[PDB]
């Protein structure tokens, strides 16, 4: 029904159940048009009785929808006035206590109340528009002016159209917040109220939370079992290394899903409209509980497979079957053809993976960017899958295959950037980004050549070491600056009070931003050294331990990056993915000063010239 571009994400399904059935009315009109007997075949009486039959049903339906809208609007208006009274009482109680954090929570409550008022204004406007279009179509199709007369007689005098208390409540809320929650300042108060929490007024389904608890408990006890089994049951005269890489890939996947659930929670509460940026379906999206539940389920499977590897559950089944069973079940749960077990999200993810891997052919949305960059962060999973294939194919680095596997994610985003260069034709945010994902290629290639030529012992080995170190520092500095400037939006010249930040800050505290800056610096350097070390056969002592301990750190950096990049996308629209910068919830315009300067003198001026 095309509610809006930003309000659509904040609208609860129970809100959508109370709008006019535009599609149903149009289908009814088209059914009346399609089944109409003709004057040529049937006489006028038969046609007239058919149209009377249709009009009676049509107007009964219109009366029912109008009554529904009136009743729901009355309920929501009463709720809004009651909540405004309660909030004023709380604010006055706080002021009386102080004169003779709760204040931040109270500003948040005012933001949610403002969002409710905007949604009710939307409720008035779109329902009136729907009635007007439906009755205009009725007039066009049946050639009778009964639609317009009925609209004038009933719709235009209905309470939802005429009651203008919502505008007054909006103005009073703005005045209250401006003059009482902050000092005299309207820009700051409107800036705070214009970004309400995206989380609409529905709790968890009350069974997803229970399953999250179930899987968290099983996961905690299984981890304790893993720790005890590893401490006591230790192998002898065998290499546990082939198992640790496989379960490392599994662990990074599970941890990424958990941290992505935390990211969804952070975006939803802070106000970042990730639904619009990701271009998700505004109806039936996933909160953080669902992601936590999926992460817990895969963690249970991973822990069970690892315990089966440590113990000997089934004598006939060998040890290497358990990783096979684990990843077979994971991939089947990813490519399940049926409609069960998160079919919507699973199919969305499959479509997104198809568009990411065949990058230049598909137009680059925001989701393709986000998931290609997540692949840039999670390349260790791809490498461990490659190692699993190698270890299960050759037995139980053919020719630079590992280097290609490392460079696959960087190549995907490199070619996406070039495709966006072809499409948009702007060299600033695209070719620079491509240069970044090519410096990653240079890093990997020179590390591999250094590893190969260290065996030769030729004097060119030091030249390749110098090339590796210079490209290491270049890629680290390049990615760090690009992150903190274009991907995060920090270090802006416009901010005066936020110091080394930008004008608009969504998250409640600033120390988050600073600690994120430091961790992002040290962890980008660690990520680059991890790529270099894992791409080189320098020494197996630190190798396979540096990567193992630094990969979860890399996923940590990536989810922090997720927070701040989505915040930048909401605020400063750093990517040209949508042709509207302003997503923040704002009401319609008000020009009461235009009635002033009129009503008193010779207005005139109605003529064009």
């Amino acid at each position: 029904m095309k509610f809006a571009e930003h309000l659509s994400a904040h609208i609860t399904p129970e809100w959508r159940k109370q709008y006019i059935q535009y599609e149903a009315f149009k289908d009814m009109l088209y059914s009346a048009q399609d089944q109409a007997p003709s004057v040529e075949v049937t006489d006028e009486d038969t046609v007239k009785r058919y149209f009377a039959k249709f009009e009676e049903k049509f107007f009964q339906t219109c009366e029912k929808e109008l009554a529904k809208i009136n009743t729901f609007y009355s309920e929501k208006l009463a709720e809004a006035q009651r909540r405004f009274a309660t909030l004023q009482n709380e604010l006055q109680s706080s002021l009386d206590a102080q004169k003779e954090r709760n204040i931040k929570d109270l500003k948040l409550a005012f933001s949610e109340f403002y969002l409710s008022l905007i949604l009710l204004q939307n409720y008035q406007n779109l329902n009136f528009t729907g009635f007007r279009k439906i009755l205009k179509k009725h007039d066009k199709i049946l050639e009778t002016s009964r639609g317009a007369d009925w609209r004038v007689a009933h719709v235009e005098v209905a309470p939802f159209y005429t009651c203008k208390k919502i505008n007054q409540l909006i103005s009073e809320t703005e005045a209250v917040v401006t003059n009482e929650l902050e000092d005299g300042d309207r820009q700051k108060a409107m800036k705070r109220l214009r970004v309400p929490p995206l989380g609409a007024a529905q709790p968890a389904p009350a069974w997803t939370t229970f399953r999250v608890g179930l899987f968290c408990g099983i996961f905690i006890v299984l981890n304790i079992t893993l720790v005890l089994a590893a401490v006591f049951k230790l192998e002898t005269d065998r290499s546990i290394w082939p198992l640790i890489r496989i379960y490392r890939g599994g662990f990074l996947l599970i941890e990424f899903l958990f941290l992505l659930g935390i990211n969804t929670y952070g975006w939803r509460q802070a106000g970042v409209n990730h639904v619009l940026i990701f271009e998700l379906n505004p109806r039936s999206n996933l909160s953080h509980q669902h992601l936590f539940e999926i992460a817990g389920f895969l963690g249970i499977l991973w822990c069970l497979s690892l315990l089966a590897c440590f113990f000997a559950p089934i004598s006939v089944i060998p040890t290497y079957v358990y990783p096979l069973a684990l990843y077979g079940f994971m991939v089947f749960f990813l490519i399940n053809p049926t409609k069960t077990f998160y079919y919507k999200s699973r199919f969305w993810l499959l479509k997104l993976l198809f568009r990411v891997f065949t990058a230049p052919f598909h137009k680059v949305g925001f989701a393709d960017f986000w998931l290609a960059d997540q692949l840039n962060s999670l390349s260790v999973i791809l490498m461990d899958l490659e190692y699993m294939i190698c270890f299960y194919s050759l037995e139980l680095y053919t020719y630079g295959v590992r280097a290609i596997v490392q460079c696959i994610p960087a190549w995907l985003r490199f070619i996406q950037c070039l495709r966006r260069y072809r499409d948009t034709k702007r060299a600033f945010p695209h070719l620079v980004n491509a240069g970044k994902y090519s410096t990653t290629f240079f890093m990997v290639t020179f590390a591999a050549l250094y590893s190969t030529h260290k065996e030769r012992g030729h004097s060119d080995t030091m030249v390749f070491f110098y090339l590796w170190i210079v490209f290491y520092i270049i890629s680290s500095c390049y990615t760090l600056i690009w992150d903190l400037k274009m991907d995060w939006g920090l270090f802006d010249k416009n901010a005066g009070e936020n110091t080394f930040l930008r004008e608009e800050i969504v998250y409640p505290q600033k120390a988050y931003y600073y600690c994120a800056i430091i961790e992002d610096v040290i962890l980008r350097f660690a990520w680059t050294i991890q790529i270099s070390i894992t791409s080189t056969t320098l020494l197996p002592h630190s190798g396979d331990i540096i990567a193992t301990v630094f990969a979860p750190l890399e996923v940590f950096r990536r989810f922090v990056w997720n927070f701040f990049r989505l915040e930048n996308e909401h605020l400063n629209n750093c990517g040209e993915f949508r042709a509207v910068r302003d997503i923040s919830v704002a009401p319609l315009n008000a020009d009461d000063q235009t009635l002033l300067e009129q009503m008193m003198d010779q207005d005139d001026g109605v003529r064009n010239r």
């Binding site: 203008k164 007054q168 103005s171 009073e172 003059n179 009461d592 009635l595 010779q602 109605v606």
Partner: protein
Amino acid sequence: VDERNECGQTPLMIAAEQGNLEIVKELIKNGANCNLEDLDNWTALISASKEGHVHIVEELLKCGVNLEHRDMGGWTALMWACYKGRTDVVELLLSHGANPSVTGLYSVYPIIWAAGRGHADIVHLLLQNGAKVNCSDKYGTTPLVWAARKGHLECVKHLLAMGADVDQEGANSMTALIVAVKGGYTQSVKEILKRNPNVNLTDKDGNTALMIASKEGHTEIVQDLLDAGTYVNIPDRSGDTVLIGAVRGGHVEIVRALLQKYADIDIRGQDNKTALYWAVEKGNATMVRDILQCNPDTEITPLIKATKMRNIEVVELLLDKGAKVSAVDKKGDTPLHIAIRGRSRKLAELLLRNPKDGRLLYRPNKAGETPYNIDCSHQKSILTQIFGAR
């Protein structure tokens, strides 16, 4: 029979502004299509209703013309006739059956324009033809608020004769009473109050009718609101009370009117301020006497400002209530120093009527400041006369 004048305008509409009987007769003699409209959605009827003669309006009434026609801005002939005040022509249009309930593109109705402009007779005619009385503007402003904004007594009387609601809130959170009080139209306020308004409602700033009337200085409006049953001590956003505002403004009559009806005085304003504090700061004798006569608390300090002002009548008023001297300023400066250097000879013998005051410096020693140093430097010390006398 068609003439392209490069403007798309028929000669009739161009001549309507300079309407003359001779040109109208000449045009009607040369039979031409009167039904022709304008390129700018205008009509000769629009110009006739604006200021044209009643003769041309009646002539345009004859023969098929679009009586209920919408112009470029959506304003009909009736809307332009009501806006630009003209009782006649409006009379003929209303008698001929023109719809008064037409709605403009600004969601402003003819009654609203007639009331705001103040043409009371057009308002009366519109009401007499059945125009809806309790209608609203697109901001929620009933015609009552528009009429009372400029205080048109006749418009408000005529519109309240029908029974328009007063509690309905207009634009910017305003009712008829509040805007009438802002405009200082006393008789309009009486007319509104005659129909039992909700006096206690607040304006956009939070100011009630009584607060605005007191700050502006409308004594009669204040007394009428008080008789209506206004809640006196509703606090301002600054924390000041209506009595505090009245005494600060310098309105003795409003202070007396607020005290006639039993209103609190010990109310606590912003940063330890009361009505007596402001009165003694401004030193108005009648205001201080009126506040003190009704038994306020002089404990909360008035001593410092009373000493600083040094006005003798203020001192005589304030000392009789019995304010305790041992209060000292928070700034650390003892009032005794300025009381001595100020040549307070007349008050000296007046200050030897109570034991504690007579003791003066011997009782308190807080800051260690001994004013005897200044007394020794003075050739003529005040307290030495009393000490040598007895």
